[PDB]
Amino acid sequence: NDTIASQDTPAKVVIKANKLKDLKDYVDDLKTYNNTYSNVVTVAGEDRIETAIELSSKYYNSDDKNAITDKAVNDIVLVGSTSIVDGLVASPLASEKTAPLLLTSKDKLDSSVKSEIKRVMNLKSDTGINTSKKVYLAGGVNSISKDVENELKNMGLKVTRLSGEDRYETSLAIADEIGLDNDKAFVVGGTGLADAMSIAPVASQLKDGDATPIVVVDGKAKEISDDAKSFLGTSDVDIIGGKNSVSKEIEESIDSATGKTPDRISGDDRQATNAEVLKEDDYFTDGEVVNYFVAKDGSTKEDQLVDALAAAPIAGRFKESPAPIILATDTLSSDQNVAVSKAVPKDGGTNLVQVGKGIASSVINKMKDLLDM
Amino acid sequence: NDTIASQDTPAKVVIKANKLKDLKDYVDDLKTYNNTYSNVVTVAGEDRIETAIELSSKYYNSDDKNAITDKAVNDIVLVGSTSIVDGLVASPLASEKTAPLLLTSKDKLDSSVKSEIKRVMNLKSDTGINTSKKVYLAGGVNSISKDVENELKNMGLKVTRLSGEDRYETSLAIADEIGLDNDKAFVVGGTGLADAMSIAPVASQLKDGDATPIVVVDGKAKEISDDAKSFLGTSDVDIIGGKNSVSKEIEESIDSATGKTPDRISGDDRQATNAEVLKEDDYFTDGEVVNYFVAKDGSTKEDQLVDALAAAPIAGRFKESPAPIILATDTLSSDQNVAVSKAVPKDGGTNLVQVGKGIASSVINKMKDLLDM
Amino acid sequence: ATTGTQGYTVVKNDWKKAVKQLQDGLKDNSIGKITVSFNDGVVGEVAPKSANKKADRDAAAEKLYNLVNTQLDKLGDGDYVDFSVDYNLENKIITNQADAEAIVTKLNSLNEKTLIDIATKDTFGMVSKTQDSEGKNVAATKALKVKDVATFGLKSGGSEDTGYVVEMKAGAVEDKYGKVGDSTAGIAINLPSTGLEYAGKGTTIDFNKTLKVDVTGGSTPSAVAVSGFVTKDDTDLAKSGTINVRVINAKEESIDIDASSYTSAENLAKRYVFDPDEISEAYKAIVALQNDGIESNLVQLVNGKYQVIFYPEGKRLE
Amino acid sequence: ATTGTQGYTVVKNDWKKAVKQLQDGLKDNSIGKITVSFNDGVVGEVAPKSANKKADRDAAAEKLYNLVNTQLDKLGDGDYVDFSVDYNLENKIITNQADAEAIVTKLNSLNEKTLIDIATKDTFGMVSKTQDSEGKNVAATKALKVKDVATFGLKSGGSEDTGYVVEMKAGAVEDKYGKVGDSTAGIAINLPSTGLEYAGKGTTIDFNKTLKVDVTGGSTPSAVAVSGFVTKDDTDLAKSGTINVRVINAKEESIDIDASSYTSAENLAKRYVFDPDEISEAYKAIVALQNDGIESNLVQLVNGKYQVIFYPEGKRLE
């Protein structure tokens, strides 16, 4: 009626009760609190830049239990910290390249970021930086200036810039690098920032190594661009967002070009659209989604969606079960609550990762309830 | 007349010359600059506390080429950042225990230090802190307060305090933990702080796992303490420092107690004594010392010898060839210049580690010349 | 001996009682040999030179204590002492004469307990040996008590070397079994002829079965018998084998949920990290026991309270 | 090819000339086969169907270019192309009739060069075949020039298929070797009977040894000979074997120490990290060559300049 304990154990815990039911309840709570203090992690710094670094340090070149890689990486994806628009579709790139998505100030490369780059890639004075060490700049000069690009080159790294004359051309530059190999692509409107962040984790899900590209299109135009049409070829397209993000005209345009009827995952607002991504069976299976990420929705400010941008690749590759990102600053929507409820198994969730500061307590609490944590 | 180059090589460097001698000179300079930008490291932060952390992060639980250990450690040695006197003889303890020597503020455990402790010991929320994780506090309450000791206990670490009513009793507490197992001990005067730092690397040299203890004695007293006599037993003693640090009376006292004639390694000043430690054949072999550490001498301020304190264990265990510490803030002494000259082989030095900020450039340059770097 | 094994884990504070039990075991001849280890290394071996000699068993017990008392008493963190205990319950004896007399007085405390009541017209009981003038049974003077059935006391020829033996001697009863006013002759009361001895060979007297009446026939009784000593195995554990005991430098944490003040499950999680599989398996064993009839090693009834045991990995950070 | 093995490393910028040399090698029949690899994977094999046919050799050369020209021209970072070259210099031929005639005219430009001067009383030279009335040697009419020794021109039966061959035909000389006024008879001049052909079998004509006079005897000469074609190996490398060539996407850094402006050793160290053992071995090879005359593969004389090659690990941080 006993086992021989390890010599290093700090205590012998004997939990007694007259009633087996009172014991049951205690041991249940113990389990919950044990798992919760173990699997309910917050990954945040004081800045948006620090949050991205925290993500990189935890998940890339890390001994952490849920790390994407334990060895040094060969690729970085860098995004302008303010410019959510330029790097909007960079998450699937970061995923495919086995790279952290880091944020930098536009003018000067942040010393914090420089340090993390050295750490994650294992760059040292005594060791040569061979041509396999690569840094992708997602955005033009207005998001990541030439000054920063030259500073990265000066340290001895190969620097490829994925950019165009506008957000649309820039997205195609990024999407082109990712490649449309699995006959599937995601399309988002120019202003549909939260929508791109809802789908980013899904796009970041790798199948035989390849991520799925996201393309930004002019949602109020008569037609999409020749470049978009050429890139999209004859692939299945899922439009993320409502008519106000990507019009009826654009849907037809994509229909005509591809010759295949595009799907539409959308809601009345950003939180509804986020819920729909989770509810969509193609992206997630009912009662088989255990790992979850939470980040701000960008209702207060749009550029605060960069937390989700940095997190999305990790969410896509997380453990052995891809995770969505729930978008919520102050409050979860009714649609989200439902979505998670149907997504999570009977047993409940096994991982919850809050990304960034300023996410209200009710939100995490609600998530913990829904996941039984 | 050629080799098949690696695919990842950034260039093919062809160095040509009409005169073989001009080539010789170029390739010689190349070698020097190549080794120097590789093996002449500075390890310093903005604070004394940060310098110690930098040392820990570089050499303990590190993938660095010259790291003391690549896995997580089980022991920390903590010292009050201002109190050089209390932790004076802690370096050989840190060495024997395979521990970094960290510095903390007396009242509040520094967040920087707390973070490094977690990193170096690999402490995590999801993993249990078993009873093998130990933190030694070298000093009484006036160097490291109860507040800090309780804060370390609260994190889940075993905390043993090595202290006494004064510096002398505290040294014996530390020396007692190290153990006088190899029938040998070092003795330094109460005011001989620089002398203790000169010998600390030597004391930190392990032989069959064991370091050699250092004991502080009242240098102007008629006799050493009963506790010192009891600890020292019948062992060989090497006194470090001149008459003004440890009197003739004390030498006799140690002679009488041990029954063995104590040696004396000393000079007219601290820099001379430092040189003598290097010149002493028992501690270092002529033309076989290639690795060198440099730190401030404490002439400007005595407490600035904490850099040497933190470095000394690493110096003792460095690579496969123990290193001394040269004590010099603004200038090397004539004795030091000579000492290194005789110490270094014909080939020159292979490693130079500057520890801390305010070491003058002439000093490092002189060292680089003496070591042919 | 080894961390995952079946065996006992004694905390430091209780080392004295644990060693005393091993000493008692050596004295009463339960334990043939104890191999002692300080951490991973075997340091000593305790065994009486001849089990049949009392002095040799006491010598073994003294040596055992002398060896380990300082190591256990001053046990540091991470240190532990393992005892591999070769035992054999069939060799166990009652080596103290005071212990044998303690059983005799335990038996004597039942002397006044009524086994069979005096008979009535409705209910069967004790009747007289001879019937009335009409040829019907009449009630007995007194009820049948334990004092009427047998006397107790230790047998002659016992010793500390070989062991003592509590003995039961059958009495005599003239009164018989029947109903008052019944024509059928009272049935003779069969007194204990067997199970008259008890040596205590790793077994204890089952008082539910010892000196109990056994009426045979049901509605029409034909025979009445009173049992002698009926024993029971004092443990579920095997008669012979080897047992591993380990002392560790850990504090015992008593969490009584029924108490006025106890450590909440939250604060317990805050203080220690538990192995998830250790908990989940314990929880599943509780749920299974609650919902179905399924008993488990993980959950057990001890001292009128259901309990689980956890040896956490270590303390939790912060 | 494999990293660190013996073989050639061509930078991207020079891929065109490298492939042209392989093409020329295929055309002139030096190269029997080339196995091509894009990165680690073998993608193609170039070889003429029959080496004796010109068309087949040209076809091989065209195929080689067609295969690799896009891969090499657009070579990305980390990518490389390896050529395993089965060669045999003995099979090498002169495929152009213009090249053969260029050698003939090169030989014909020596026709007026005097090999042996007319004899004097002091110095040995050319004398007449018959002595004067008194029985002493008399000076020859003309000196011995190259035109007197042999005529040049390409041999009949040559073709682009099999190859052309420059031929030397020995002349005739009546005049002999001696001193004027000497009684001993003039020594017969041995004209070239061997080395009359040159096909260019991986060799070039050594003009220091070709058509040179070889007087035997010293103070008292006994024999005089004029050599035919004496060749020299155009490269130090073996006649037959297999060689590995690798193109990489790296920039070439020419560091000429004799130039007005070059990269200082400091700035070079600042820009790249070098393998310490790669340098030390190179330095030791230079010192050894400087002090002791010991030659090495690591340091070599090329175009009147001593050179070393370094392939650094990568660029240096900061």
Residue numbers in the entry:
A (entry chain B), B (entry chain D): 2 to 374
C (entry chain A), D (entry chain C): 1 to 318
Please give me the paper's original passages concerning this structure.
These subunits then form a complex (referred to as H/L) that is incorporated in the S-layer.
The three CWB2 motifs form a triangular prism and adopt an intertwined fold, with a β-strand from one CWB2 inserting into the neighbouring domain to complete a β-sheet (β2H in CWB21 completes CWB23, strand β6H from CWB22 inserts into CWB21 and β10H in CWB23 is inserted into CWB22) sandwiched between two α-helical regions. The environment- and cell-facing sides of SLPH exhibit considerable charge differences, with a mostly negatively charged external surface and a largely non-polar cell wall-facing base, decorated by positive patches. In the crystal, two H/L complexes, related by pseudo-twofold symmetry, are present in the P1 asymmetric unit, packed in a 2D planar array which is then stacked to extend the crystal into the third dimension. The 2D lattice is achieved by tiling of SLPH, with interlocked ridges of SLPL molecules covering gaps between the tiles, creating a tightly packed layer. As hypothesised, the p2 symmetric 2D lattices of native S-layer ghosts (a = b = 80 Å, γ = 100°) were consistent with unit cell parameters of the stacked lattices in the 2D plane of the X-ray crystals (b = 78 Å, c = 80 Å, α = 100°), pointing towards a similar packing. In contrast, tiling of SLPH and the SLPL ridges generate a compact lattice apart from two distinct pores in the C. difficile S-layer array. Pore 1 (cyan arrow, between molecules 1 and 3) is ~20 Å across the widest point at the environment-facing surface but is partially occluded by the LID/HID motif narrowing it down to an 11 Å wide cavity.
